[PDB]
Design a protein around this ligand. Structure first.
Ligand SMILES: CC1(C)c2ccccc2-c2ccc(C[C@@H](CC(=O)O)C(=O)C(=O)O)cc21
Ligand SMILES: CC1(C)c2ccccc2-c2ccc(C[C@@H](CC(=O)O)C(=O)C(=O)O)cc21
Ligand SMILES: [Zn+2]
Ligand SMILES: [Zn+2]
Lengths: 335, 335
């Protein structure tokens, strides 16, 4: 259920702001960073929402006015879409599938241009949607650097150490419009997902639900995304989607969501909730141990499947032949 | 059609001695070793029957009386079966499938015992069937060694050289009863199949008909055999068997059939034709070239499929999990 804001300011959000879907869910635990149950969840690679990390405390004052003034004159990737679904695709793989036309057009622009185009849309009541997704880098201004340095690196660096993770790969600045949806997908990195402004509903699925979520081929641009349209699921093509069960939560300013590697996540900015701001923290997973302990984890089997698809594409000399060979291998033999 | 014996002795065989099957065939060419068309077939890894190699000329005098006297007192593997089908299975893999019970019982015995048990069956008109399949080795007697040395090693060694093949892996002595059938299977070696006594009908299928012949899993004891019962094909499980087309021939004394590596072959001793004797010559294929030339050959794709199945069994730690993972990989993704 919804949490209540301090000072009797009422519920920060209500259930009417959540999109409706076909599957059940149960809540992700919301715990204190000091709660040993939280440490045991992270250690066991299960999601948890940490409510008191102060991980991005200096950034909670961030809004568009503050950011436009201080974030500098770097280039910012901005994605557009006529729909509320922003497809998570890979431009590098778009050669393999010359018949895929993305619905999200990316445009590189300056931050003040992003704010203006967002203003124009609001002014003219248009229905276009935007989502800024830019990797924080050196070009940012001095006041943003100060805020960045003020993150709780003591806490997150200890986590990185305790879990044997690799190095911090990148920090994404995410600014979206209300109602924006990032479709279900999984990442090959560990993620601390730090909510700054507004509210995002996060629906996670464990890696062992690979069978119910039907990812695109590895060589397809939408690799690691679910093929299932959550708003109109085609149960004839994706029958096991009727067996999916999610882990759900709404994160607001100050919350940090641990999204374990290989865990599917569907992320939506709440309807009529205003703009949302998030910074995430991606870390390479711990290295694979020398002695493999059976039985394998679900995510290890996903890695095996990915590697098979990759090698088959290399050996055949064409990713388009992967599908035909795999069917040849199974039809009448393993089915 | 049937060939005619020299001296007006009539047709060596007639069509009534061939079992009836559901698929069409076209004949394998029967050519002289000196015919350049024969060399081009072998070079292109296509089957050909060579009629004048004299490859096993000294062995054409062989019969059970001569062999029992001179072949020595070694052990000979003899397979039995209540049916005319002798299943080509692997005892080493029988651990993976503890629910597979072979129909062919192997018994190790001396050659005179093989002849006697064959005599008893004939005497009592029983319906049991036998097939002797023993790798020629050192234990053979002096007169058989003399015959072996008298093979045409000049010709076959030149073939081995011209084709870049590896070394001769083994020579099998095959003695079967009329009507015996070795079900369709492929071998991972090059084979010169030298017919000595009696007549065998050989039905070959190219490697690109993998889809129509449904081999067992690689880890199954009957690896490399077709799952399809040629006498009663289950078209519901094996629908593409209705598209199979074979290459057919009957080899008699003096003929040599080149069975190229990875080519399926179904081999049957002719009905009411008496006992059959064959010696085959297995060679390791030429090494895979350093620069792979695309498009791949059909047999290279078969090798890829075999390797995928093998690696999946090793990685998962159990060959029984191969099937489930492959289905998970394809369902709703590549089909
Ligand atoms: C939707 C978008 C802007 C996008 C478009 C095109 C290519 C890639 C991406 C991409 C990658 C990550 C995110 C952040 C977050 C989802 C969220 O919060 O919306 C998430 O999935 C994660 O932290 O792992 C968002 C995006
Ligand atoms: C049927 C039999 C006796 C068998 C039983 C159990 C395990 C293995 C084998 C095996 C292997 C080879 C052959 C010879 C030939 C077929 C033929 O002429 O009958 C052939 O397939 C080939 O030369 O490649 C025959 C057999
Ligand atoms: Zn993600
Ligand atoms: Zn064979």
């Amino acid at each position: 259920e919804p949490r209540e804001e301090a000072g009797a300011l009422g519920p920060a959000w209500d259930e009417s702001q959540l999109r409706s879907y076909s599957f059940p869910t149960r809540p992700i635990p919301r715990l204190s960073q000091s709660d040993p149950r939280a440490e045991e969840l992270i250690e066991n690679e299960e999601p948890v929402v940490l409510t008191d990390t102060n991980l991005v405390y200096p950034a909670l004052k961030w809004d568009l006015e503050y950011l436009q003034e201080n974030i500098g004159n770097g280039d910012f990737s901005v994605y557009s879409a006529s729909t509320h679904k922003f497809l998570y695709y890979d431009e590098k793989k778009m050669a393999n599938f010359q018949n895929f036309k993305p619905r999200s057009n990316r445009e590189e622009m300056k931050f003040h241009e992003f704010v203006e185009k967002l203003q124009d849309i609001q002014q003219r009541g248009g229905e276009e949607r935007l989502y800024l997704q830019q990797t924080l880098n050196d070009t940012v201004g001095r006041k943003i650097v100060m805020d960045f340095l003020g993150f709780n690196w003591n806490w997150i660096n200890k986590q990185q150490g305790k879990r044997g993770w690799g190095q911090l790969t990148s920090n994404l600045l995410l600014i979206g419009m209300e109602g924006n949806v990032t479709p279900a997908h999984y990442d090959e990195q560990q993620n601390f997902f730090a909510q700054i402004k507004g509210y995002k509903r996060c629906i996670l699925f464990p890696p062992d639900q690979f069978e119910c979520l039907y990812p695109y081929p590895v060589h397809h641009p939408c690799d690691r995304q679910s093929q299932v349209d959550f708003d109109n699921p085609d149960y004839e093509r994706f029958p096991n989607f009727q067996n999916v069960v999610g882990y759900e939560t709404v994160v607001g300013p100050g919350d940090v969501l641990y999204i374990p590697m290989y865990w599917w996540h569907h992320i939506e900015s709440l309807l009529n909730g205003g703009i949302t701001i998030t910074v995430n923290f991606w870390y390479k997973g711990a290295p694979t141990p020398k002695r493999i302990e059976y039985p394998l984890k679900a995510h290890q089997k996903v890695a095996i499947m990915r590697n098979i698809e990759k090698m088959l594409g290399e050996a055949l000399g064409n990713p388009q032949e992967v599908g035909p060979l795999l069917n040849t291998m199974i039809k009448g033999r393993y089915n």
